[PDB]
C-alpha cells in the first residue's frame, strides 16, 4: 500500500531455483548503506513449498563475514503477496517476472509513517540484463526511493557481491 504493482496470474512454483540480486533500491539510504546495512541481502535461491509458502536462501554480511540465511515468506490470499514474521512483520510482493530471465520484488513494512520499502531486480544468470533494469526503473518511479545499487557480473559471482 505504497507498492500497487503486483504480478497478475503469478505461478509461484515457477520462480523456483537460482537468482542473482543484480540491483537493489530502498526508501532510506541507511537501509542499503554498508555491507551490513539491514536490507542489503543477496538472494541465492527461491524455494516455494508444495503448500505455497516461499523460502528464500540469501547471503547477508553479518559480523565481518558473509553469512548464510534462510527466510520463510508465508503465503497470503493474494498469490503475489507473502508475509514475514517479526517485531514489525513485513510484506513481500512479487511485482513482475517472466520466470526465465527476471523477477522484480519489494519488501515493505505495514507502517506508516514510515513508508519504508526495499526492492530488487533479480536475474537468473550473472549478466547485466538491460531489459530487466528498465522494468525495475519503471516500477521504481512510482515509489519514493533514495538509494539505488547496481552490481557487475564479477561481483554477482562472489559471496556477498565482493
Curated annotation (Swiss-Prot):
Entry keywords, A to Z: Allergen, Disulfide bond, Milk protein, Retinol-binding, Secreted, Signal, Transport
Subcellular location: Secreted
Example GO molecular function: long-chain fatty acid binding
Chief location of this protein within or outside the cell: secreted
Cysteines engaged in disulfide bonds, as pairs: 66-160, 106-119, 106-121
PROSITE patterns: LIPOCALIN
Name of this protein: Beta-lactoglobulin
Upper classification of the organism: Eukaryota, Metazoa, Chordata, Craniata, Vertebrata
Amino acid at each position: 500500500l505504497i507498492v500497487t504493482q503486483t504480478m497478475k496470474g503469478l505461478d509461484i512454483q515457477k520462480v523456483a531455483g537460482t537468482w542473482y540480486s543484480l540491483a537493489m533500491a530502498a526508501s532510506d539510504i541507511s537501509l542499503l548503506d554498508a555491507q551490513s546495512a539491514p536490507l542489503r541481502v543477496y538472494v541465492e535461491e527461491l524455494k516455494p513449498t508444495p503448500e505455497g509458502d516461499l523460502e528464500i536462501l540469501l547471503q547477508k554480511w553479518e559480523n565481518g563475514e558473509c553469512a548464510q540465511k534462510k527466510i520463510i515468506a508465508e503465503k497470503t490470499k493474494i498469490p503475489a503477496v507473502f508475509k514475514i514474521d517479526a517485531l514489525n512483520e513485513n510484506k513481500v510482493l512479487v511485482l513482475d517476472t517472466d520466470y526465465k530471465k527476471y523477477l522484480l520484488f519489494c519488501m515493505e513494512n505495514s507502517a506508516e509513517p514510515e513508508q519504508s520499502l526495499a526492492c530488487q531486480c533479480l536475474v537468473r544468470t550473472p549478466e547485466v540484463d538491460d531489459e530487466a533494469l528498465e522494468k525495475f526503473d519503471k516500477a521504481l518511479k512510482a515509489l519514493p526511493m533514495h538509494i539505488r545499487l547496481s552490481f557487475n557480473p564479477t561481483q554477482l559471482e562472489e559471496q556477498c557481491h565482493i
